[PDB]
Symmetry: none
Subunit: 194 residues, 4 copies
Amino acid sequence: FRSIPAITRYWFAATVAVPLVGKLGLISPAYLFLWPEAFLYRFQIWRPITATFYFPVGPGTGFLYLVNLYFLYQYSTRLETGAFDGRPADYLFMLLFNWICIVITGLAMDMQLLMIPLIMSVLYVWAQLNRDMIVSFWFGTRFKACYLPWVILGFNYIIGGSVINELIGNLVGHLYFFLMFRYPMDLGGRNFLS
Amino acid sequence: FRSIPAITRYWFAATVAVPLVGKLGLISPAYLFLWPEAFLYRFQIWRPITATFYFPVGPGTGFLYLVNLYFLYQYSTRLETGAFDGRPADYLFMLLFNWICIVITGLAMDMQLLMIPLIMSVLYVWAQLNRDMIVSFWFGTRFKACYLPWVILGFNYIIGGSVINELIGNLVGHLYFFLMFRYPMDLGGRNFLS
Amino acid sequence: FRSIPAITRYWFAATVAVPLVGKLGLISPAYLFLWPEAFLYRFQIWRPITATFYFPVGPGTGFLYLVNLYFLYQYSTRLETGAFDGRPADYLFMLLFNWICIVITGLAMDMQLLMIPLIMSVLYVWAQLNRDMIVSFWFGTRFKACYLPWVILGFNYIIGGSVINELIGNLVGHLYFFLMFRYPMDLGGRNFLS
Amino acid sequence: FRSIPAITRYWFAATVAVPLVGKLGLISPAYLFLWPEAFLYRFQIWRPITATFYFPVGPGTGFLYLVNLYFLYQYSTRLETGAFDGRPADYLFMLLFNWICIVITGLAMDMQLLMIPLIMSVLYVWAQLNRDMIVSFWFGTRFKACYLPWVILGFNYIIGGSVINELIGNLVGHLYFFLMFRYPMDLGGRNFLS
């Protein structure tokens, strides 16, 4: 939807374009998995940037991708109209921070598809920046907010799935919230353009 | 109701019937795949024609069959009633022409079940000659014209499998449209039952 | 529900009791499969009576059993209050007829769990004896009757499954309906007790 | 709400927590199975107690965990509030006594995850002394007393797996019921924190 929705729609364009160049057969998808065993000794700088945008699509894994893209579009732009309003280098620094933390803890783990925890992290930091909102749902129209990433884990226990793909992002959101709210000197750097 | 709504609904009857012969267990489904290299060395003229009358319904690929068959019935007779009330022989020639090229481009590539791209070919050919009609869905009535091939491509991309097979059907549909509504000497064949 | 619902509840008691003696581990269920290869040369008179009452239960095949037992209790007792009203040797002769026919045609096939087609057969003969009933459903509250066993096949194509477990019963129901309605001399025999 | 609703909800906290340790990937689930013959030769006192605090949630056995945990929380504190407002030490002795016999009858048989039968043991002990209460379900309010163990056995029989695990839990519940409400000299132990 290129009709000026926000400033950072390049992310949404990348996450809709890269599985289309993966699935069609231009590049064999074996080169996009973020292998830490191939990142330890061999340098191979392709993976930790090409893995955060690619998601594999299969006939049976085709609703997680759609609902994660919906979470991305619907909950990143609310910060774009509510928190990104001016000084956008600050919130680009926010989005880089949990990026580098979750890629280094995915090297600490053995997780290989790094697209879910970043969106879960930005969803949790949305819900934590907007505590005490009376409406959060449409069936149970009254809902206590900020519990949404845990309700995502509840729907994961309904679908079975796994929880290792989400709780690291849901913890790094609390990490950034603590280092922002509690203590100062978590400021940006050079290359300011605003 | 099978009250002969159009002159060529034996296509619909056969594309319902032959998958019941497949799933019933009379002939093995491995005999109906259009193995192209087995069509190359061996003669085997059993399978350029039965491959486009087959779809392996079962555990998981069940909604795709119903949606594509519904779109086939829903738009074939509407193509017949719109700007095709006469000349049924030229309509049969149209239904032959995209087939005799899609069998070649499917023989070069590695596609097996050529049921979906021919249905989206005739849907695309309907889309080119039916501009400004907006009433498409019962719920989504705001769908603009010549967008429905891309959204059924999106449905086959999310629920189904590959994407390279439907794009070549759109390509051969555009090929027939340009070669039929711009240039002469493509009338049809003799001994037509017009 | 032993509270006098009908006359032939012995069938329902058998079909609720035999999977409980199978699943608990008293008898290894390898002796209950109706092997025609063990019925051809070896006599082995256990199988074609012990296989028509036993149904295997697994965590994931646990709704077909419940819905088939519901079809049994709901649609056999309707004949008990509508067609079995007196002279019950006639309808015992009905229930034994399609029993031995689907036994001999399951020997003609290789199908091994003989519980579904008998209930589908008696459901189809119910719907055929009650042609021109205005109500047949609750969501689409107007429904043309006797299409119910084909709607069961439609829900099978939704669930994927297989249609060889139902169409032989749905055909033997039409066989009995033809041999009852069209021609005489399909009468019972001795051991009358009514 | 964790507002300490009863004195022994650490059971509930642990039976929620330890499956997250299992599904998280810290300790392998093969170390927590109560292999009885491996408990026979080897000492291995890691596994009489961790086996009754575990359930392998995931792809397929997900609703059984939620329903059984809901029944545990819903009836443990209601047993505590009904005829057990005093004497918590005898309640703890009750929660020990069925365990120290179910570990023996599970060691003789081949059961692994002793979470379900202890919950239905305490549910059956509740049902045995709570006659004539009819209001049980929010929809099915006509459920008579001392029938709920059989219907949760039916739920575990249809959705879950085996049936031999729950009957010995009902048996040891009846054993404790008769041996506690008829015969003396089973008071408890010294150093009780009453």
